[PDB]
DNA sequence: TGCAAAAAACGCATATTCTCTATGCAAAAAACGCATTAATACGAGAATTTTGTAGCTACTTATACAAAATTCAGGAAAATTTTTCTGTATAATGGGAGCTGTCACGGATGCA
């Protein structure tokens, strides 16, 4: 089962260290070159589970 | 239970009279004066005489040389303790002791 990895005793005193120094809050590394839409659910009309992300204007 | 009323007491007639307010007597204190004697103090004399001043004299000390008769600081032996060095001869042939339950981070390497 999904289970809670949320919280609501959450952003304390740890959770602002990790932005201090400026660690990788979440490890991301989402990029930006601007389209941007809906774009399906991930991408390319997605599919079963697929995974892409989103596009307008542009190449 | 209202008084009218009688007798004896209790109130308007003086003797008595007796504490009582009132002056002359008298006796001894006292204090004042006659006063007398003695003592408290003035006068003179020369005697002691201590204090005040000078010079002499004896005691006391200012000072100038220094090795007195005694103290001490090293110097160089011992005296005993202690310290460093050297030496004693069968065989002996690879070292124990915890680390193994922390979470998270930042490089830094290895390993295909």
């Given at each position: 089962?999904?289970?809670?990895?949320?919280?609501?005793?959450?952003?304390?005193?740890?959770?602002?260290?990790?932005?201090?120094?400026?660690?990788?809050?979440?490890?991301?590394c989402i990029l930006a070159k601007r389209?941007?839409?809906?774009?399906?659910?991930?991408?390319?009309?997605?599919?079963?589970?697929?995974?892409?992300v989103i596009?307008?204007?542009?190449?």
């Amino acid at each position: 089962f999904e289970r809670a990895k949320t919280g609501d005793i959450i952003q304390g005193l740890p959770r602002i260290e990790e932005l201090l120094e400026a660690r990788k809050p979440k490890e991301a590394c989402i990029l930006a070159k601007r389209g941007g839409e809906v774009k399906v659910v991930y991408g390319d009309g997605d599919e079963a589970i697929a995974i892409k992300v989103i596009e307008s204007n542009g190449v």
